[PDB]
Structures are given as structure tokens and as C-alpha cells.
């Protein structure tokens, strides 16, 4: 069973505020599977820097807040990350929780990026090769 | 891999190839899928693209099988597609049955003269001289791309050190172009006596035609397979006198041009070739590259040694 | 610089007297 939509404007608030769409009932071609990144599904944060523009990284994914460990964020994920929060250039990496601990859950999952992607939820992912990160390790940046 | 049971992991799914990586990859995984295609135990599992860099998808990674699987798909993996390598990383086997010869010589330079040795199993070892042919030892000039004939020279009384062996009675028809096709006796490891051990020489990759000695003549050279001519550019005493040396014949007294003893046969293999006269062998010299002539057999090469 | 294939994975390590 399919829904289709004719077309909506874009202005509503629910999908069901979209006119004329078509539950079932139609014969779906081969071109299935629609799927969707909306901002929110990867957001980043900088707490606890002296600037806004600088401090631990924090990714909401899903509803989630979560750090991001020293190992899994490279220097092309932190030129995405300060160009999607408007920061300006990536000036420095750094280690070893230097702006402090996180708390909670850190994400053991690694940002392919090649740079250029506007948001990190474009960013290809990769499952982190075995080993427990620690708060004490938690990733820094500073932007320009 | 050279065969049947040796190369780079490639696997069918959804219609396209695609590879594994190397990380975890050990003998247990190798072993499942030198199973797999039915090839025996796993002798050596080859990581960082031993064989060269795959195609496609990486789509195996993080093997961890516990070596009872019939089917590599079947070990606990981090699922298809799941990866984070590249084909630079992309796994290998060797298996026990993957076969290889060579001819091991001692004192000679030559490639293709020595004894016949074949990896088998993890290991080299001897042939057995019992049944074998002078058809026989041309099938392994062949197939070591050495030259179409050889002869077995007699054994070096004078070795006292005894070399496993893995075969003997090796016969071969006239036809198959590799020893495996060739019926012989079963696997079985033996100490072979020196007097057992078969000792080849292939003939020479360079022979003089049409002189009226032995050591004058049209130089012909034996490469890919076929007998080929060398073009008279750059021709001079310096050629004759290598070409005289590889045939042990003494000084060069003349090189001649112009196919005075007749033309050639067959591809001209070298052109511009410029010896010092002091290399070992005319491959050594340099020239044009193999096979590239603008030479007609009128330009075949000739020499005059002592 | 700064133009590496190589993951972490590959991070080079020393050991000397
Ligand atoms: C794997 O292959 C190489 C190829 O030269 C061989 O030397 C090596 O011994 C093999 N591994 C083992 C454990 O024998
Ligand atoms: C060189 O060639 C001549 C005639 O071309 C031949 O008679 C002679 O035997 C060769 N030289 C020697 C020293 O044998
Ligand atoms: C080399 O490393 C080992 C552990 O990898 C360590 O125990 C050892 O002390 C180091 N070598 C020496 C000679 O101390």
C-alpha cells in the first residue's frame, strides 16, 4: 500500500493538510523507496568554549545528545561542522577533552566526509572498530 | 592468483562483484572460502591486495567465522555493506593444492636451466626423473615460457644433499600446455636420491640458422612463445661479439647485414639493439621494445664468430 | 601533507630502547 501526493504548497503544518493525496490504489511504478534527511537529524553543538564558536562537539541524533570521541572526527568533519553552524574556517582540533568531559552517551560512529557536504547528515558513516571510548577523549573544536 | 585456487575474494551479490577487506582476515576465514570452492586447506592467507586492487564494493569486513561454515556469507560479519575499508585493503588466499614449478639453478644466471622444483602444499620439492619424456621436459619449457624443447641433463654426482619429492612418472601426451593435465604417480613425500632428482636445460633462447658452421649464421631468438629474427639498425661488432659469447663460440670476426644467409621468420623481436659487447646475454642490451620492428626480413642479422 | 588513503587503522606506532 502506497500513498500518493499530487502536490502540496509546502506552507502546511501536516502532511495531511497536503491536498489530494491518493492512499492505495494505484499500480506503483518500479521507482519506489522515497526517503528523506531533514536537518535535524544530525545537529551540531558546541558547549562549554570560551566562544560560541568553539568547545566540546555535541551531535543530537534522533533526540539524543551525544559527544563525539577524539578518534572518530577528522579534520574534514570539522571543516563540515564549522561551516554548518556558520563558524567560519576549522582553526584547531582538539584532544583529550580539553574543554571538559562530556556527559552521557558518545557516539562510536565515524564521519566520512569529504569536506564539501553542507551538513554532517549528508556525511557517509562507518561502524567504529572495536573499542570503548571514554569521556576523557572526547573531541574539541575551535572555528575562525 | 595464477590458478584456480589462489587471488583476490571476489563475491556475486545482487547481480555485481564485489570484494572483501583484509581486516580480520585470517586462516579460518581463508579456510572457509578455500572450501567454498572446494580447494582444500587454506596455506596462506595474503592481506593489502597481495593480488592486485579489486572492482566495485568492498562487501565483506570484520570476518570472524568459525571455520565450519559452509559458506563465507554464512560467518558472523558486520553485514553486507557494512564496511569501512578500501580495495587497497581487499583479501587473498593461497591453498594447499595451489601448484607452481620453477627450475632452481645454483650456478648459473639462466632461468631456464637448473632443476625442476614444484611448490606444492606449502613446499617445494623434486620430480622424480622415472618415465619422464623429452616431451615431457618441452612441456615445461613451455609452460615456463622458456623455449618449445629441452634436454634432462644427467645429475652432479657430486651433490650430497637429499630434496624431498612429490612426484614422479610424469607423462605427458603431446597437447596439454601445463604438467598438471599430465597423469603421474600420487602425491607422496619422499627423500629422493640425488640420481632421482630430473635436472633440465631448455636450449638456448638464441640459435644461428642457415651458417656454414655452427657458429656463423642468421641470429634468431626465441621469445613469447614463437622463434623471431633481430633487425640489422645499429647492428655492429659489438652485437656479433655478444651474440657469439651466449653461444660460447669465441670472438666475433663479422657481423654481417642485409639477410645475406636468407630472411628470418616469423616477428622481428628486436630493433636498434646497442650491446657494449661485455652483457651477459642480448636481453641485456638495450633496444626498442620487444616485438616493435619497422624492419622487413631483408634487415635479418647475421654473424661470423671463430 | 595532509593528503592520506590510510584510516586509523593504519596509525603508525614505535617502540625503541
Ligand atoms: C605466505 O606467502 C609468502 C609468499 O612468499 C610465503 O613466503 C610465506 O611463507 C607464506 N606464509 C607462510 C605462513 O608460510
Ligand atoms: C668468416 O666468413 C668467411 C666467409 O664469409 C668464412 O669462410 C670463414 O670461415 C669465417 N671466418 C673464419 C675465421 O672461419
Ligand atoms: C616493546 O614493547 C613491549 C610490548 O609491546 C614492551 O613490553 C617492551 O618493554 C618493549 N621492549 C622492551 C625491550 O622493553
Same mark, same amino acid.
Given at each position: 500500500?502506497? *500513498?500518493? *501526493?499530487?502536490?502540496?504548497?509546502?506552507?502546511?503544518?501536516?502532511?495531511?493538510?497536503?491536498?489530494?493525496?491518493?492512499?492505495?490504489?494505484?499500480?506503483?511504478?518500479?521507482?519506489?523507496?522515497?526517503?528523506?534527511?531533514?536537518?535535524?537529524?544530525?545537529?551540531?553543538?558546541?558547549?562549554?568554549?570560551?566562544?560560541?564558536?568553539?568547545?566540546?562537539?555535541?551531535?543530537?541524533?534522533?533526540?539524543?545528545?551525544?559527544?563525539?570521541?577524539?578518534?572518530?572526527?577528522?579534520?574534514? $568533519?570539522?571543516?563540515?561542522?564549522?561551516?554548518?553552524?556558520?563558524?567560519?574556517?576549522?582553526?584547531?582540533?582538539?584532544?583529550? $577533552?580539553?574543554?571538559?568531559?562530556?556527559?552521557?552517551?558518545?557516539? $562510536?560512529?565515524?564521519?566520512?566526509?569529504?569536506?564539501?557536504?553542507?551538513? *554532517?547528515? *549528508?556525511?557517509?558513516?562507518?561502524?567504529?572498530?572495536?573499542?570503548?571510548?571514554?569521556?576523557?577523549?572526547?573531541?574539541?573544536?575551535?572555528?575562525? | 592468483?595464477?590458478?584456480?585456487?589462489?587471488?583476490?575474494?571476489?563475491?556475486?551479490?545482487?547481480?555485481?562483484?564485489?570484494?572483501?577487506?583484509?581486516?580480520?582476515?585470517? =586462516?579460518?576465514?581463508? +579456510?572457509?572460502?578455500?572450501?567454498?570452492?572446494?580447494?582444500?586447506?587454506?596455506?596462506?592467507?595474503?592481506?593489502?591486495?597481495?593480488?592486485?586492487?579489486?572492482?566495485?564494493?568492498?562487501?565483506?569486513? %570484520?570476518?570472524?567465522?568459525?571455520?565450519?561454515?559452509?559458506?563465507?556469507?554464512?560467518? +558472523?560479519? +558486520?553485514?553486507?555493506?557494512?564496511?569501512?575499508? @578500501? +580495495?587497497?585493503?581487499?583479501?587473498?588466499?593461497?591453498?594447499?593444492?595451489?601448484? #607452481?614449478?620453477? =627450475?632452481?639453478?645454483?650456478? #648459473? @644466471?639462466?632461468?631456464?636451466?637448473?632443476?625442476?622444483?614444484?611448490?606444492?602444499?606449502?613446499?617445494?620439492?623434486?620430480?622424480?626423473?622415472?618415465?619422464?619424456? %623429452?616431451?615431457?621436459?618441452?612441456?615445461?619449457? @613451455?609452460?615456463?615460457?622458456?623455449?618449445?624443447?629441452?634436454?634432462?641433463?644427467?645429475?652432479?654426482?657430486?651433490?650430497?644433499?637429499?630434496? /624431498?619429492?612429490?612426484?614422479?612418472?610424469?607423462?605427458?601426451?603431446?597437447?596439454?600446455?601445463?604438467?598438471?593435465?599430465?597423469?603421474?604417480?600420487?602425491?607422496?613425500? @619422499?627423500?629422493?636420491?640425488?640420481?632421482?632428482?630430473?635436472?633440465?636445460?631448455?636450449?638456448?633462447?638464441?640459435?644461428?640458422?642457415?651458417? /656454414?658452421?655452427?657458429?656463423?649464421?642468421?641470429?634468431?631468438?626465441?621469445?613469447?612463445?614463437?622463434?623471431?629474427?633481430?633487425?640489422?639498425?645499429?647492428?655492429?661488432?659489438?652485437?656479433?661479439?655478444?651474440?657469439?659469447?651466449?653461444?660460447?663460440?669465441?670472438?666475433?670476426?663479422?657481423?654481417?647485414?642485409?639477410? %645475406?644467409?636468407?630472411?628470418?621468420?616469423?616477428?622481428?623481436?628486436?630493433? %636498434?639493439?646497442?650491446?657494449?659487447?661485455?652483457?651477459?646475454?642480448?636481453?641485456?642490451?638495450?633496444?626498442?621494445?620487444?616485438?616493435?620492428?619497422?624492419?622487413?626480413?631483408?634487415?635479418?642479422?647475421?654473424?661470423?664468430?671463430?
Amino acid at each position: 500500500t502506497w *500513498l500518493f *501526493l499530487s502536490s502540496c504548497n509546502g506552507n502546511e503544518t501536516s502532511l495531511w493538510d497536503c491536498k489530494n493525496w491518493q492512499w492505495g490504489g494505484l499500480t506503483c511504478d518500479h521507482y519506489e523507496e522515497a526517503k528523506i534527511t531533514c536537518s535535524a537529524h544530525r545537529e551540531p553543538r558546541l558547549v562549554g568554549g570560551d566562544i560560541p564558536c568553539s568547545g566540546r562537539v555535541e551531535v543530537k541524533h534522533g533526540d539524543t545528545w551525544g559527544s563525539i570521541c577524539d578518534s572518530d572526527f577528522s579534520l574534514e $568533519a570539522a571543516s563540515v561542522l564549522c561551516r554548518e553552524l556558520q563558524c567560519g574556517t576549522v582553526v584547531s582540533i582538539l584532544g583529550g $577533552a580539553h574543554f571538559g568531559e562530556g556527559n552521557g552517551q558518545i557516539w $562510536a560512529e565515524e564521519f566520512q566526509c569529504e569536506g564539501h557536504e553542507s551538513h *554532517l547528515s *549528508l556525511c557517509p558513516v562507518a561502524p567504529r572498530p572495536e573499542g570503548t571510548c571514554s569521556h576523557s577523549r572526547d573531541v574539541g573544536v575551535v572555528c575562525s | 592468483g595464477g590458478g584456480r585456487c589462489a587471488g583476490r575474494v571476489e563475491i556475486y551479490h545482487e547481480g555485481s562483484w564485489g570484494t572483501i577487506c583484509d581486516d580480520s582476515w585470517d =586462516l579460518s576465514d581463508a +579456510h572457509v572460502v578455500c572450501r567454498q570452492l572446494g580447494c582444500g586447506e587454506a596455506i596462506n592467507a595474503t592481506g593489502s591486495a597481495h593480488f592486485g586492487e579489486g572492482t566495485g564494493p568492498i562487501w565483506l569486513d %570484520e570476518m570472524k567465522c568459525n571455520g565450519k561454515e559452509s559458506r563465507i556469507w554464512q560467518c +558472523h560479519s +558486520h553485514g553486507w555493506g557494512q564496511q569501512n575499508c @578500501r +580495495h587497497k585493503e581487499d583479501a587473498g588466499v593461497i591453498c594447499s593444492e595451489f601448484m #607452481s614449478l620453477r =627450475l632452481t639453478s645454483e650456478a #648459473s @644466471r639462466e632461468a631456464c636451466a637448473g632443476r625442476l622444483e614444484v611448490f606444492y602444499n606449502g613446499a617445494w620439492g623434486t620430480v622424480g626423473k622415472s618415465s619422464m619424456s %623429452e616431451t615431457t621436459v618441452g612441456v615445461v619449457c @613451455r609452460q615456463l615460457g622458456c623455449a618449445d624443447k629441452g634436454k634432462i641433463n644427467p645429475a652432479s654426482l657430486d651433490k650430497a644433499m637429499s630434496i /624431498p619429492m612429490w612426484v614422479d612418472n610424469v607423462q605427458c601426451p603431446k597437447g596439454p600446455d601445463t604438467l598438471w593435465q599430465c597423469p603421474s604417480s600420487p602425491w607422496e613425500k @619422499r627423500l629422493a636420491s640425488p640420481s632421482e632428482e630430473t635436472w633440465i636445460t631448455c636450449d638456448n633462447k638464441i640459435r644461428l640458422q642457415e651458417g /656454414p658452421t655452427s657458429c656463423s649464421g642468421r641470429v634468431e631468438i626465441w621469445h613469447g612463445g614463437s622463434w623471431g629474427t633481430v633487425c640489422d639498425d645499429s647492428w655492429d661488432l659489438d652485437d656479433a661479439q655478444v651474440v657469439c659469447q651466449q653461444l660460447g663460440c669465441g670472438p666475433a670476426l663479422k657481423a654481417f647485414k642485409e639477410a %645475406e644467409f636468407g630472411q628470418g621468420t616469423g616477428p622481428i623481436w628486436l630493433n %636498434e639493439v646497442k650491446c657494449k659487447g661485455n652483457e651477459s646475454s642480448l636481453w641485456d642490451c638495450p633496444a626498442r621494445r620487444w616485438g616493435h620492428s619497422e624492419c622487413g626480413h631483408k634487415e635479418d642479422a647475421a654473424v661470423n664468430c671463430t
